[PDB]
Amino acid sequence: AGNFWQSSHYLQWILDKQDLLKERQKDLKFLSEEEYWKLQIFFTNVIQALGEHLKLRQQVIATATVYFKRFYARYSLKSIDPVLMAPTCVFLASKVEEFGVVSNTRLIAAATSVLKTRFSYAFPKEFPYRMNHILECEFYLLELMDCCLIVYHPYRPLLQYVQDMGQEDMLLPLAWRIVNDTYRTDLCLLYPPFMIALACLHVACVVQQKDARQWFAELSVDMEKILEIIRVILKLYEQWKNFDERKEMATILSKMPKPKPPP
Amino acid sequence: MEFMDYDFKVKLSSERERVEDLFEYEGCKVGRGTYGHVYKAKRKDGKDDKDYALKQIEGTGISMSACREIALLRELKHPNVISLQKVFLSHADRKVWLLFDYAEHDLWHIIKFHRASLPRGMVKSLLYQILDGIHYLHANWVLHRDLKPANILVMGEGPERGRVKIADMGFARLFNVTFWYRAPELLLGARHYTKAIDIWAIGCIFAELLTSEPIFHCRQESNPYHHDQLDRIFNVMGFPADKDWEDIKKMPEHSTLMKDFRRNTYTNCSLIKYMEKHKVKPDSKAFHLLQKLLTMDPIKRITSEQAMQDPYFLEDPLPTSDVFAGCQIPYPKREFLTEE
Ligand SMILES: CNC(=O)c1cc(-c2ccncc2)c[nH]1
* Amino acid (one-letter) located at A247: K
A201 vs A175: CA distance, rounded Å: 5
What is the side-by-side order of every strand in the sheet holding B164-166?
B105-106, B152-154, B164-166
Are B201 and B212 members of one domain? yes
B55 vs B166: CA distance, rounded Å: 15
Strands (E), chain B: 23-24, 29-33, 36-43, 52-57, 86-90, 95-101, 105-106, 142-143, 152-154, 164-166, 173-174
B136 vs A1: CA distance, rounded Å: 11
Please choose, from the candidates B23, B81, B26, the residue with its C-alpha nearest in 3D space to the C-alpha of residue B52: B23
Are B189 and B338 members of one domain? yes
Are B292 and B239 members of one domain? yes
Would you say A43 and A86 are in contact if contact means Cβ atoms under 8 Å apart? yes
Question: Environment class of residue A54 by beta-carbon count within 10 Å: exposed (0-12), middle (13-18) or buried (19+)?
Answer: buried
B227 vs B307: CA distance, rounded Å: 30
Nearest CA to ligand 1 atom 4: B168
Which residue of chain B is at minimal alpha-carbon distance from A78? Answer: B5
- Contact with chain B for residue A135, Cβ under 8 A: yes
Are B92 and B140 members of one domain? no
Q: Which residues contact A211 (CB under 8 A, 6 or more apart)?
A: A205
CA distance B317 to chain A (A): 34
Are B31 and B122 members of one domain? no
* Amino acid (one-letter) located at A193: P
Q: Which residues contact B182 (CB under 8 A, 6 or more apart)?
A: B200, B201, B226, B229
What phi, psi does B276 have (nearest 5°)?
A: -55, -45
B340 vs B338: CA distance, rounded Å: 7
What phi, psi does B2 have (nearest 5°)?
A: -120, 95
Would you say B210 and B194 are in contact if contact means Cβ atoms under 8 Å apart? no
Nearest CA to ligand 1 atom 2: B168
Domain boundary among B57, B87, B102: B102
| Domain extent for B179 | 103-340
Method used to obtain the model = X-ray
What phi, psi does B172 have (nearest 5°)?
A: -65, 160
Active-site annotation of B, residues: 146
Is B55 annotated among the ligand-binding residues? yes
Within 8 A of B142 by CB-CB distance, chain A residues are 1
Q: Which fold has domain A19-150?
A: Cyclin A; domain 1 (1.10.472)
A1-18+151-263: CATH number: 1.10.472.10
Cβ–ligand 1 contact at B100 (below 6 Å) = yes
Cβ contacts below 8 Å, chain A against chain B, sum to: 95
Are B32 and B150 members of one domain? no
Are B15 and B81 members of one domain? yes
Q: What is the CATH number of the domain that holds B115?
A: 1.10.510.10
A163 vs A171: CA distance, rounded Å: 10
Q: What is the CATH number of the domain that holds B6?
A: 3.30.200.20
Are B82 and B221 members of one domain? no
Are B332 and B271 members of one domain? yes
Is B267 annotated among the ligand-binding residues? no
Nearest CB to B2 within list A95, A148, A262: A262
Domain boundary among B42, B67, B102: B102
CA distance B311 to chain A (A): 29
Are B213 and B144 members of one domain? yes
Cβ–ligand 1 contact at B296 (below 6 Å) = no
B228 vs B179: CA distance, rounded Å: 10
CB contact under 8 A, B89 and A143: yes
Task: Write the DSSP assignment of A13-59 as a string of letters.
Answer: HS--HHHHHHHHGGGGGTS-HHHHHHHHHHHHHHHHHHHHHTT--HH
Are B223 and B264 members of one domain? yes
Domain boundary among B102, B125, B149: B102
Q: Where are the domains of chain A?
A: 1-18+151-263, 19-150
Task: Write the DSSP assignment of B8-48 as a string of letters.
Answer: HHHHHHHH---HHHHEE-TT-EEEEETTEEEEEEEETT-S-
Are B176 and B51 members of one domain? no
Q: Same fold for the domain at A1-18+151-263 and the one at A19-150?
A: yes
Within 8 A of B17 by CB-CB distance, chain A residues are none
Would you say A257 and A76 are in contact if contact means Cβ atoms under 8 Å apart? yes
* Domain count of the fold of chain B: 2
